[PDB]
Swiss-Prot record, chain C:
This is NADH-ubiquinone oxidoreductase chain 5. The gene is MT-ND5. It is found in: Mitochondrion inner membrane. It comes from Ovis aries. Core subunit of the mitochondrial membrane respiratory chain NADH dehydrogenase (Complex I) which catalyzes electron transfer from NADH through the respiratory chain, using ubiquinone as an electron acceptor. Essential for the catalytic activity and assembly of complex I. Belongs to the complex I subunit 5 family. Core subunit of respiratory chain NADH dehydrogenase (Complex I) which is composed of 45 different subunits. The chain crosses the membrane at residues 16-36. The chain holds residues 442 to 496 of 606 of the full protein.
From Swiss-Prot, chain E:
It catalyses: a ubiquinone + NADH + 5 H(+)(in) = a ubiquinol + NAD(+) + 4 H(+)(out). Its main location: mitochondrion. The keyword Phosphoprotein does not apply. This is NADH-ubiquinone oxidoreductase chain 4. It comes from Ovis aries (Sheep). InterPro entries: NADH4_N (IPR000260), NADH_Q_OxRdtase_chainM/4 (IPR010227), NADH_UbQ_OxRdtase (IPR003918), ND/Mrp_TM (IPR001750). Keywords: Electron transport, Membrane, Mitochondrion, Mitochondrion inner membrane, NAD, Respiratory chain, Translocase, Transmembrane, Transmembrane helix, Transport, Ubiquinone. It is a multi-pass membrane protein. The gene is MT-ND4.
UniProtKB/Swiss-Prot annotation, chain G:
Disulfide bonds: none annotated. Belongs to the complex I subunit 5 family. Core subunit of the mitochondrial membrane respiratory chain NADH dehydrogenase (Complex I) which catalyzes electron transfer from NADH through the respiratory chain, using ubiquinone as an electron acceptor. Essential for the catalytic activity and assembly of complex I. The chain holds residues 1 to 111 of 606 of the full protein. This is NADH-ubiquinone oxidoreductase chain 5. It comes from Ovis aries (Sheep).
Length: 176, 60, 55, 68, 459, 171, 111, 59, 119, 87, 128, 157
């Protein structure tokens, strides 16, 4: 369950278990130096069997690693106050108006902020001008009828923007 | 004509009007009644609002 | 950004420690006695709270 | 050069509705308050005498408040 | 009272001989003058009820409902534009005249002399509303909704007529005092059971009760806003008023025969509060909420306490205002997005920010806000049912908890947490929307100041 | 003033203070400051308004009612006889409600005056409260809501018939 | 005593003015937190007095007015009292929440 | 100080105006558990000495 | 103390039990033992509205304590000698109640075990 | 509650905390350099670098994104994307 | 070194120990690739009908409307009265109802007999 | 503006036609489409789901709807109204589940057991009753001002 591929490249599964075990040991162990000791011991235990050239032995050790990890996990990992499920988890979400709005203001306030609205108009020119031919032709020409990916190609043709830029660029500052 | 002639004017209109269910009138009537009954010695609110002399029971 | 160079917060915490060190004895002294205080305890029945908190 | 462009949904329709609402309840709220003020400071409520015998009053002149 | 009847007749051709862009001003202005005329009514004093005519009379229980009807009319005519404003002027005049004729039958219904006249005006209350919701239901099963509507109400309401002719031909005339002042305790035969069950069953259909409830929610989810608010408020609380009137008779046998109606009422109140906690299609939540509150009303009617009657009529008026408001909230979100679903349209904490306080107060009044009329009515209902039975409080409090829960979930589902970032068309809050909001919730709290009007005949 | 004879109000017992302090006495200084601030303009404005009351004369009366014959004197139909009897009985019911209201606030005032002394100086007012509520529970209580006058008459008949047979078979 | 009841009722009624003051303004107070802080400080310094009068005297009282739905054999009004708990519990909560008003001035600066 | 002047002198005037006249023309109204009288004191209203308590001893 | 351990582990027989405390009748070993001084003026005890469960012995110390607390109130640290007198009088009464318990304990134990060893 | 940031300053801070690490030399540590190719560290030490800078900057990056950093320039770019570093 | 984490109707099995992600079939990887293709095509046409500046209104989700009409209108068809439906209908429609019925008659008969004798708390029992 | 064919008439028979229609209409795999089956419980031919959707679907996948966990392409969940975050946290349990219920029931049972043990066998300082001076505090009780002067006195020890 991933954007790019369908499988997830077994080395990466080992690396995921590495990061989660190291994070849960952060949560397990205060004082940071006995933590450094335990992390280096775990890192050495991983390096005991790094160059095994098999695969069935590797995934057997992976199964036993998952058993020992799920036994020796911790209930509340130290997840950061930006992480999902953490302390913030969009704490200051309150001022996240997506900027398709602000064109429905009254023209008195639009006279109050002239520079930003004229520059918004020239971004709107930039949005409309490159929208039809280059964007639709790159989306309909280079992919196959099965699109087979989630990544989009750059507009390496001559000039203007790679497609789908509007909602990706014009999203808020994530801290109002 | 939704508020400025209906709402506050109707609220001041219904905010005072005569005592619905004769309320203060019943207060003053109860005051006179209890004062009369205590001043004439009898205990207030004897039972049998219908007169027990005004009865003809079916005899056994 | 560890910054407590702040007049509002030092005023509030200052005034609440003033209200947290005098007002307990002051309020507990000037009440009408609405019940019977016991005042007669054996050994390790008055000392027991301090003993348990120290251990 | 340091302040950021603040973002709001909309303000003007909200302020217009609330201004019209407060002013149009204000327009015939204050004269009614002043009218009932002049009533209970000038004309008074009533007094509390008794029925004279040999006299029948109205079905008004029984009620305490004068506007009632 | 005919001084209140005949200008409503005079307002009927007003829309006809009004020109273009003048129907709105004439109708709204003159119906608000009728609202002043309606507030003039309360002359009623103390012991008896006042008589207006050789024909009819006003009870103290009829007057707040007449005030509610003639106050809900201008709010509603103000409400039901802009979804038919793109259509024709002749059809618009047809719609306005149909609403005014509907109001006129409603006033004849609430101010009835006799129960035969109440029956005539009862099915006259029925019929034009179905024409309204069938012609502008704006959803594909409005046909089946109206068909269910008229078949259930006319099928339940059929033996009421024959029972009333029987009360006519064995007890003289049917006017409420000589229908009163003469009654006798009719013993435990079967004819008393069947006649009682016929009249009470007709009004059971009209509330609705639980076993015949699906009459109601289709007729709310597949109706326009005018017919829906009139439908819920005026029709269901009219059925409650009708039962409150007719229940003076047949008191010695209703103790023997009134248990399973209480049973289906309470247990269906529980199950209906359970069903409107999980559902999407937000419009249905108000309908099942109304089923819950009118089941509570029915429990309060079949227990026969003055506390119960005052609490029941307060709950009637309060939930009528509440459901008409919440219908208008659903129509506001429907004008924003043409969805009718619940989980799709979200956000709106930023967007239209002061509408959030109105959604708050609506969920507060369905939440039994603690000085609101809704809580006072439900409080007297709970007190009276615990006096009737020392064991009934489990179902009442479970109704209270789940009622709070689905009203709160109805709040925080569509207007809490995150914009869906694909709506990207909606306009800010109109003047008309919060105008209708201020027309809803100001008289509710101003009755919450002085509720001396809105209690029963034994105030 | 008002009717202080149908409203029992016992006299007060205020002791005299005697400091024994040199703080001195913040409550006396404080209440004199409060009087010299607030009490004078309230008195002057009240005197202005009372002269404006003194300029004009309004009155209102007690709408007293006559006496109806009875309902037991009415025959089986007698509709205008019944109408008078029923409305007079309903007004008796309402004024009896206000009797219970007055005795309930009497009990409230007795509980609030005596304070911690519960049964002292309130046992007899509690006793007459129980007396009048015994009368009320026996008479108006257990009949329902769709009464006019007739059901109270039926319960009255049934109660005195039961009491008649009870004392005759117990005597 | 007019003072004791009147000062308890003004310690009540001081806690209403910012509500109407924002509802009737439309051009909102920039120093609204300073406004709320000084009126809560005023509420505390007015609630100091009847507590001192209480523990100096006693004199434990009830006030009651504006009876609505005096319908049946019972009756009820807006009715509250000062005995000992409701008497001296008020200034503690007011002083605490005044300090919380200071901490909420500071803590919610950049929002 | 003018803030305090308006804000706790206008409602004080209004509440002291209301809490004499209307609140005492309603008779059954605001009422008080009396301050306690003591057996070795004097009455400020009427005035008579109360007998104190008798001999204390064996403390 | 060991009273509870003995009462719940050994016998509850010779240890008397609360809320059924007066077991033997009076003047069995009193002779002429009752004073119960109590000149605390029952009527004036009503007149001074003490708290309930305080209209009791040692009440006059509380009367004087409230008297000096009232008549010199803003002297915040004034009344302590009468306060200690009242505490000492309740100490006397508490010792007297413990004397009641232990007197019933000694009587019940000694006489019941004597008569039930040789009767 | 307003920490200022700048691109060159945060670039120097990330370069500084890279230079603090042991097994790469402080002499040859480029702004634009590979990780697996030239610096002589494996995948495991690279994700340890990731973990330490997550712990310092107070927001994690996921393993679905940890496949594809490979160079400090994209690290500074991605953390600047999270922080939105302009005035 | 564990009781191997039993799954249940609440015990959500986490994606670490499946253990079906050990003996992966090549056709299961092909199914994962087909799943990626489905999500790819759907998000592709979402970004087609989503980023259009010429477009004004809502996204018009067919699947959510599909779910809503399945949940509301597609109930009564299809249906056949089977044994399980009829039994569960009698269990949830009649059972607790007759339960509350008998307990209300029982408590009511207790109250009726106790006031038929007269030994109630009706010393004052005003608000009925 | 919607097609009736985009609803779901009838159940899964037949296995060519309805399975082909479900895989083309729900945008799903053929065999991962799981009918319930048709057991007279309504349900049409709607797919069976693994039913978790909350602490599965890890938030760094970065799908479309940041709180509803959608992707705009799914059939839907049938009980999706019962399975949003802020409704039912379908998290993996940190230990087990029967372990949870048996330990919690054993602890609460032991606490109620020792509550009964306390309630039958209390503690006290060993002290006689309170010496209320006036006929065990009589006439400050319910009354009877001259009805029953009850003989009860205290005797010094």
């Amino acid at each position: 369950f991933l954007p790019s591929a369908a499988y997830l490249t077994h080395q990466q599964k080992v690396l995921q278990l590495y990061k989660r075990a190291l994070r849960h040991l952060e949560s397990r162990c205060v004082h940071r130096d006995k933590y450094r000791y335990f992390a280096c011991l775990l890192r050495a235990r991983f390096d005991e069997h790094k160059n095994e050239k098999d695969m069935v032995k590797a995934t057997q050790l992976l199964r036993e690693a998952e058993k020992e990890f799920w036994h020796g996990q911790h209930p509340q990992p130290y997840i950061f106050p930006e992480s999902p499920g953490g302390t913030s988890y969009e704490r200051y979400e309150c001022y996240k108006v997506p900027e398709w709005c602000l064109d429905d203001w009254h023209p008195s306030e639009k006279a109050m902020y002239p520079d930003y609205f004229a520059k918004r108009e020239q971004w709107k020119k930039l949005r409309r001008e490159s929208w039809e031919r280059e964007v639709k032709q790159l989306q309909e020409e280079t992919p196959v009828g099965g699109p087979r990916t989630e990544a989009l190609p750059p507009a390496r043709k001559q000039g203007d923007l790679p497609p789908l830029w509007w909602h990706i660029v014009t999203r808020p500052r994530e801290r109002p | 004509f939704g508020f400025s002639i209906v709402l506050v004017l109707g609220s001041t209109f219904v905010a005072y009007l005569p005592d619905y269910r004769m309320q203060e009138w019943a207060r003053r009537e109860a005051e006179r009644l209890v004062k009369y009954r205590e001043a004439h010695g009898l205990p207030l609110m004897e039972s049998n609002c219908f007169d027990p002399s005004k009865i003809q029971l079916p005899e056994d | 950004n560890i910054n407590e160079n702040n007049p509002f917060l030092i005023n509030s915490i200052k005034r609440l420690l003033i209200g947290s060190l005098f007002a307990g004895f002051i309020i507990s002294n000037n009440i009408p006695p609405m019940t019977i205080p016991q005042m007669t305890m054996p050994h390790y029945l008055k000392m027991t709270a301090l003993t348990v908190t120290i251990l | 050069g340091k302040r950021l462009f603040i973002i709001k949904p909309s303000g003007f329709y909200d302020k217009r509705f609330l201004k019209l609402l407060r002013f149009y309840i204000l327009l015939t709220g204050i004269p009614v308050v002043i009218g009932i003020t002049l009533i209970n400071v000038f004309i008074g409520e009533a007094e509390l005498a008794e029925i004279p015998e040999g006299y029948v009053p109205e079905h008004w002149e029984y009620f305490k408040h004068p506007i009632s | 009272m005919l001084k209140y009847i005949i200008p409503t007749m005079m307002l009927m051709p007003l829309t006809w001989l009004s020109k273009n862009s003048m129907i709105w001003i004439n109708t709204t202005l003159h119906s608000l003058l009728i609202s002043l005329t309606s507030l003039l009514l309360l002359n009623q004093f103390g012991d008896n009820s006042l008589n207006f005519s050789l024909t009819f009379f006003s009870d103290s229980l009829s007057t707040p409902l007449l005030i509610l009807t003639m106050w809900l009319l201008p709010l509603m005519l103000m409400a039901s534009q802009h979804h038919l404003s793109k259509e024709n002027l002749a059809r618009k005049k047809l719609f306005i005249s149909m609403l005014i004729l509907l109001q006129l039958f409603l006033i004849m219904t609430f101010t009835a002399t006799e129960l035969i006249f109440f029956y005539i005006m009862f099915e006259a209350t029925l019929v034009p509303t179905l024409i309204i919701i069938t012609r502008w239901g704006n959803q594909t099963e409005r046909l089946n909704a109206g068909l269910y509507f008229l078949f259930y109400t006319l099928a339940g309401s059929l033996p009421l007529l024959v029972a009333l002719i029987y009360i006519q031909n064995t007890m003289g005339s049917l006017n409420f005092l000589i229908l009163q002042y003469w009654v006798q305790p009719m013993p435990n035969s079967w004819s008393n059971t069947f006649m009682w069950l016929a009249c009470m069953m007709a009004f059971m259909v009209k509330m609705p009760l639980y076993g015949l409830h699906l009459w109601l929610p289709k007729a709310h989810v597949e109706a326009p806003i005018a017919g829906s608010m009139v439908l819920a408020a005026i029709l269901l609380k009219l059925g409650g008023y009708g039962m409150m009137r007719i229940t003076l008779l047949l008191n010695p046998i209703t103790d023997f025969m009134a248990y399973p109606f209480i049973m289906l009422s309470l247990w269906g109140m529980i199950m209906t509060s359970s069903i409107c906690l999980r559902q999407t299609d937000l419009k249905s939540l108000i309908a099942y909420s109304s089923v819950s509150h009118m089941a509570l009303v029915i429990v309060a009617i079949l227990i026969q306490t003055p506390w119960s009657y005052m609490g029941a009529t307060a709950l009637m008026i309060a939930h009528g205002l509440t459901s008409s408001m919440l219908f208008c909230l659903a129509n506001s979100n429907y004008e924003r997005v043409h969805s009718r679903t619940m989980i799709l349209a979200r956000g709106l904490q930023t967007l239209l920010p002061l509408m959030a306080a109105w959604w708050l107060l609506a969920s507060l009044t369905n939440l039994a806000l603690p000085p609101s009329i809704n809580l006072i009515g439900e409080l007297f209902v709970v007190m009276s049912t615990f006096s009737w039975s020392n064991i009934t409080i489990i179902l009442m409090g479970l109704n209270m908890v789940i009622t709070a829960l689905y009203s709160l979930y109805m709040l925080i589902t569509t207007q809490r947490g995150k914009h869906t970032h694909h709506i990207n068309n909606i306009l800010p809050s109109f003047t008309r929307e919060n105008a209708l909001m201020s027309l809803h919730m100001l008289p509710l709290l101003l009755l919450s100041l002085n509720p001396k009007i809105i209690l029963g005949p034994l105030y | 003033s008002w009717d202080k004879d149908v409203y029992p109000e016992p006299p007060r017992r205020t002791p005299a203070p005697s400091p024994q302090t040199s703080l001195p006495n913040p409550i006396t200084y404080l209440t004199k400051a409060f009087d010299l601030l607030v009490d004078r303009p309230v008195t002057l404005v009240r005197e202005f308004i009372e002269r404006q009351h003194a300029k004009n004369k309004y009155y209102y009366y007690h709408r007293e009612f006559r006496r109806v014959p009875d309902i037991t004197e009415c025959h089986e139909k007698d509709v205008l006889c019944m109408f008078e009897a029923e409305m007079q009985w309903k007004r008796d019911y309402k004024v009896d409600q206000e009797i219970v209201n007055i005795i309930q606030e009497r009990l409230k005032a007795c509980q609030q005056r005596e304070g911690e002394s519960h049964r002292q100086n309130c046992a007899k007012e509690l006793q007459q409260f129980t007396q009048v509520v015994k009368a009320y529970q026996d008479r108006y209580h257990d009949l329902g809501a769709h009464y006019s006058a007739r059901k109270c008459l039926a319960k009255q008949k049934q109660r005195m018939l039961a009491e008649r047979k009870a004392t005759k078979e117990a005597a | 005593m007019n003072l004791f009841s009147s000062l308890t009722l003004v310690t009540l009624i001081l806690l209403t003015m910012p509500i109407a003051a924002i509802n009737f303004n439309t051009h909102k107070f920039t120093n609204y937190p300073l406004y709320v802080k000084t009126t809560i400080s005023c509420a505390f310094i007015t609630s100091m007095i009847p507590t001192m009068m209480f523990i100096h005297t006693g004199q434990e009282m009830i006030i009651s007015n504006w009876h609505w739905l005096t319908i049946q054999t019972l009756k009820l009004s807006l009715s509250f009292k000062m005995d000992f708990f409701s008497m001296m519990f008020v200034p503690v909560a007011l002083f605490v929440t005044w300090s919380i008003m200071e901490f909420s001035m500071w803590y919610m600066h950049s929002d | 100080s003018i803030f305090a002047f308006t804000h706790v002198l206008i409602p004080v005037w209004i509440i002291h105006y209301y809490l004499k006249y209307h609140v005492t023309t309603k008779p059954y109204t605001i009422v008080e558990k009396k301050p306690r009288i003591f057996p070795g004191d004097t009455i400020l209203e009427t005035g008579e000495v109360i007998p104190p308590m008798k001999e204390f001893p064996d403390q | 103390g060991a009273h509870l351990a003995r009462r719940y582990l050994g016998d509850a027989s010779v240890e008397p039990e609360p809320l059924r405390m007066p077991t033997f009748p009076p003047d069995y070993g009193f002779p002429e033992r009752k004073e119960r001084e109590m000149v605390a003026t029952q009527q004036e005890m009503n007149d001074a509205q003490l708290v309930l469960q305080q209209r009791d012995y040692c009440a006059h110390y509380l009367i004087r304590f409230l008297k000096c607390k009232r008549d010199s109130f803003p002297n915040f640290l004034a009344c302590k000698h009468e306060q200690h007198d009242w505490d000492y009088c309740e100490h006397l009464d508490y010792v007297k109640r413990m004397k009641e318990f232990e007197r019933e304990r000694r009587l019940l134990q000694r006489k019941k075990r004597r008569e039930q060893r040789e009767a | 509650d307003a920490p200022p940031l700048t691109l060159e300053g945060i670039k120097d801070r990330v370069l500084y905390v890279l230079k603090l690490y042991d097994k790469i030399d402080p002499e040859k540590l480029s702004v634009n350099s590979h990780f697996m190719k030239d610096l002589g560290l494996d995948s495991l030490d690279q994700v340890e670098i990731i973990m330490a800078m997550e712990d310092e900057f107070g927001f994690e990056i996921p393993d679905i994104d940890a496949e594809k950093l490979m160079c400090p320039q994209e690290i500074v770019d991605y953390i600047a994307d999270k922080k939105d570093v302009y005035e | 070194s564990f009781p191997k984490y039993e799954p249940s109707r609440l015990a959500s099995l986490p994606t670490t120990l499946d253990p079906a992600e050990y003996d992966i079939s090549s056709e299961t990887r092909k199914a994962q690739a087909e799943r990626l293709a489905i999500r790819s095509r759907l998000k592709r046409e979402y970004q087609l009908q989503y980023n259009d500046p010429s477009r004004r209104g809502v996204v018009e989700d067919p699947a959510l409307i599909r779910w809503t009409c399945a949940r509301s209108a597609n109930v009564y068809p299809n249906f056949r009265p089977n044994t399980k439906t009829s039994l569960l209908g009698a269990l949830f429609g009649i059972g607790p109802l007759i339960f509350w019925y008998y307990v209300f008659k029982t408590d009511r008969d207790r109250k009726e007999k106790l006031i038929q004798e007269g030994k109630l708390d009706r010393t004052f029992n005003i608000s009925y | 503006s919607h097609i009736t064919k985009d609803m779901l008439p009838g159940p899964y028979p037949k296995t060519p036609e309805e399975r082909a229609a479900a895989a083309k209409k729900y945008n799903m795999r053929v065999e991962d489409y799981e009918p319930y089956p048709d057991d007279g419980m309504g349900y049409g031919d709607y797919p069976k789901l693994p039913d978790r959707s909350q602490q599965e679907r890890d938030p760094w996948y970065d799908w479309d709807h940041p709180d509803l966990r959608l992707n705009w392409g799914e059939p839907m969940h049938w009980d999706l109204d019962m399975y949003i975050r802020n409704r039912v946290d379908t998290s993996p349990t940190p230990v087990n589940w029967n372990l949870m219920c048996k330990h919690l029931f054993g602890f609460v049972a032991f606490m109620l057991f020792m509550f009964w043990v306390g309630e039958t066998y209390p503690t006290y300082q060993p002290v006689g009753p309170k010496q209320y001076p006036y006929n065990n505090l009589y006439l400050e009780r319910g009354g009877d001002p001259n009805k029953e002067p009850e003989p009860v006195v205290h005797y010094e020890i």
